[PDB]
Write a protein that binds this ligand. Structure first.
Ligand SMILES: CO[C@@H]1O[C@H](CO)[C@@H](O)[C@H](O)[C@H]1S[C@@H]1O[C@H](CO)[C@@H](O)[C@H](O)[C@H]1O
Ligand SMILES: *[C@@H]1O[C@H](CO)[C@@H](O)[C@H](O)[C@H]1NC(C)=O
Ligand SMILES: *[C@@H]1O[C@H](CO)[C@@H](O)[C@H](O)[C@H]1NC(C)=O
Ligand SMILES: *[C@@H]1O[C@H](CO)[C@@H](O)[C@H](O)[C@H]1NC(C)=O
Length: 606
């Protein structure tokens, strides 16, 4: 269809399947295996991308061009990499992926949304789709096309360091939150075939249902460990949200580090090929986790040859190498050349990677759009996040006896009030993990509003606000305070650093709460990624709020504390009495919760 140098794969009016086949039929083995290779930006250069025909780049946690980098600096990095890839013989654009898992969270000045567990508390799948929408805009502002989200793990033991990344222990709630997908990607059209990949265009991003499958079901919530459960439990708890993901056209699926009844997920041909591909009819691409194939073996990386064979034969399409790309490429090339991996397996992986790239419009818009840069940290999106933070809060207690005046909502006018605790004026702590750094961080790491700042912004001008991080009891008693807001809880963590067998918040926490509440009527805001031991915190407090990891917009906290909106959130998990009860989930036989799933007190706007 027209000029004499016409190449069908480059014709944007042809059907995606036609473009895929046309390109595929021209590629060498080296160009094919290059598509299946994703590398970290830290090892990428123009010659490496060009000479190995690389298919994808990512930024892992905290992998950034520099600290404080603008949206424009991100776009230029990405475009730099893309220009190298476009200069190959076939000019196959790369796709760049990142963990935008509560906003575009590696990026300075990006809106940071509440983490998933909070989002579960809102029971509001439309809110979540809207967060999808806004997140895609902030991701594209940085020139990125691909977000490794949502995590649709069903966390079954809060001792897991990734429990905050799961919407709920109830798979019904996780299923309903897969609306993040069409938020990120766009609504699939009228007559869409379930399992097809979809992205609407250059203002949307490819998504990633992760981590397939049973990541949330591991023994004692040990991260990357074994999930021991029969097929029926696997299918009825851990799988259903992947099917909803198929119906919404999720573009990619990332495989889990975890194992199911002893089999590494990265080596499981039955689940990856037999079930995801052949039974759910997934036509997008399947990507490893970060050195996921290495960890097939014990020790990890001790037989990389096997790692490659097993993972690729299992059915994985793209490998998040992400550093030793030369070895990965050499090994896979060697296995194809020796007939150990058939060309049909290679052609299938490449067919899928290209399908996603063509379908999302990457060949037509390989480069970043500088007018999208101003979407980073947009106030409209912060106002959404603030809404989400407010809706996520669960009021556990609001008065020490059923006869006391309720403490919340608090009046904005009072001569003098106290704000206290390690989490009252600490942005990093209120964002938690996967914020600027991989593990999150402490203090003022990005743009936002801490609890203290939000209080100051909310109160009557005549109200005197005093901050003290960890005051003693005499300070409180002597201070002439009308009430106190005290914020404490967990430090930021991510993956295995967060695995925790005791779930007790660090000190000082409880002792500040005791000191403060012993001198004045107090509202304790508890910041955590999960239920933690809370009886002592309850005994001391007039009111206690479980605010999860609410993100950059701390005004969502005060919106509820001061009565602009009523508390409506409900526990998306069971709150245990004791860690020895664990695992303990709603529907279990000796369900003995401190607070059951669904619990939450309410208030009315004032
Ligand atoms: C930087 O991402 C993380 O980096 C640390 C730094 O050492 C690695 O050891 C971690 O295992 C990865 S975790 C893994 O990364 C994916 C991409 O970052 C992510 O989508 C996935 O959910 C994680 O399990
Ligand atoms: C589970 O964790 C232990 C360390 O506690 C490790 O030795 C074992 O290999 C892990 N199993 C799996 C399947 O990851
Ligand atoms: C609880 O467990 C974590 C390990 O994840 C540890 O850092 C902390 O010191 C422990 N606290 C108590 C009270 O045992
Ligand atoms: C808010 O409205 C509910 C429903 O009628 C009511 O039960 C609750 O006690 C009210 N609280 C107020 C006005 O403080």
């Amino acid at each position: 269809h027209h000029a004499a140098d016409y190449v069908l794969y480059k014709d944007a009016t042809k059907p995606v399947e036609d473009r895929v086949a046309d390109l595929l039929g021209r590629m060498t083995l080296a160009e094919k295996i290059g598509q299946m290779t994703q590398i970290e930006r830290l090892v990428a250069t123009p010659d490496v991308l060009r000479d190995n025909f690389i298919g994808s780049l990512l930024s892992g946690g905290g992998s950034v061009p520099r600290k404080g980098a603008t949206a424009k600096e991100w776009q230029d990095m990405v475009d730099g990499f893309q220009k190298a890839c476009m200069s190959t013989r076939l000019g196959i654009p790369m796709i760049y992926g990142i963990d935008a898992v509560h906003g575009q969270n590696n990026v300075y000045g990006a809106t940071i949304f509440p983490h998933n567990v909070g989002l579960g508390a809102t029971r509001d799948p439309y809110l979540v789709k809207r967060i999808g929408e806004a997140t895609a805009l902030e991701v594209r502002a940085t020139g990125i096309q691909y977000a490794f989200a949502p995590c649709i793990a069903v966390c079954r033991d809060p001792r897991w360091g990734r429990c905050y990344e799961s919407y709920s222990e109830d798979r019904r709630i996780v299923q309903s939150m897969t609306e993040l997908i069409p938020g990120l990607q766009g609504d699939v059209p009228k007559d869409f075939t379930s399992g097809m990949p979809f992205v609407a265009g250059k203002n949307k991003v490819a998504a990633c249902a992760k981590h397939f499958v049973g990541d949330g079901g591991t023994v004692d919530g040990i991260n990357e460990n074994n999930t021991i459960i029969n097929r029926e439990g696997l299918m009825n708890i851990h799988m259903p949200a992947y099917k909803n993901a198929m119906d919404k056209g999720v573009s990619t699926v990332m495989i889990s580090y975890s194992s199911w009844n002893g089999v590494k997920m990265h080596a499981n041909q039955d689940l990856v090929t037999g079930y995801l591909k052949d039974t759910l009819k997934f036509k997008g691409f399947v990507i490893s986790d970060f050195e996921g194939i290495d960890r097939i073996t014990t020790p990890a990386g001790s037989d990389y040859s096997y790692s490659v064979k097993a993972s690729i034969l299992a059915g994985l399409d793209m490998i998040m190498v992400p550093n030793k790309y030369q070895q990965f490429i050499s090994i896979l090339t060697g296995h194809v050349n020796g007939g150990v991996i058939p060309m049909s397996r290679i052609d299938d992986a490449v067919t899928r990677i290209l399908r996603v790239k063509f379908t999302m419009g990457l060949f037509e818009n390989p480069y970043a759009d500088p007018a999208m840069a101003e979407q980073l940290g947009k106030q409209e999106h912060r106002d959404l996040a603030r809404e989400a933070a407010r809706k996520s809060l669960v009021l556990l207690k609001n008065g020490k006896t059923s006869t006391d005046a309720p403490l919340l909502p608090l009046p904005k006018k009072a001569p003098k009030i106290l704000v206290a605790g390690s989490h009252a004026d600490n942005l990093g702590y209120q964002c938690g993990g996967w914020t600027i750094e991989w593990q999150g961080d402490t203090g003022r790491t990005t743009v936002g509003t801490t609890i203290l700042e939000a209080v100051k912004a909310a109160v009557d001008p005549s109200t005197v606000v005093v901050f003290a991080e960890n005051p003693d009891a005499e300070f409180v008693k002597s201070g002439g305070f009308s009430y106190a807001i005290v914020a404490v809880g967990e430090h930021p963590y991510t993956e295995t650093k967060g695995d925790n067998l005791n779930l007790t918040i660090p000190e000082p926490g409880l002792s500040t709460v005791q000191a403060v509440c012993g001198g004045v009527r107090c509202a304790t805001v508890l910041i955590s990624g999960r239920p933690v031991v809370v009886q002592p915190l309850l005994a001391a407090s007039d009111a206690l709020v479980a605010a999860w990891l609410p993100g950059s917009e701390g005004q969502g906290v005060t919106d509820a504390l001061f009565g602009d909106f009523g508390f409506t959130g409900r526990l998306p998990r069971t709150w245990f009495k004791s860690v020895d009860q664990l695992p303990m989930n709603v529907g279990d036989a000796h369900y003995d919760p401190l607070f059951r799933l669904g619990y939450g007190l309410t208030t009315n706007a004032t």
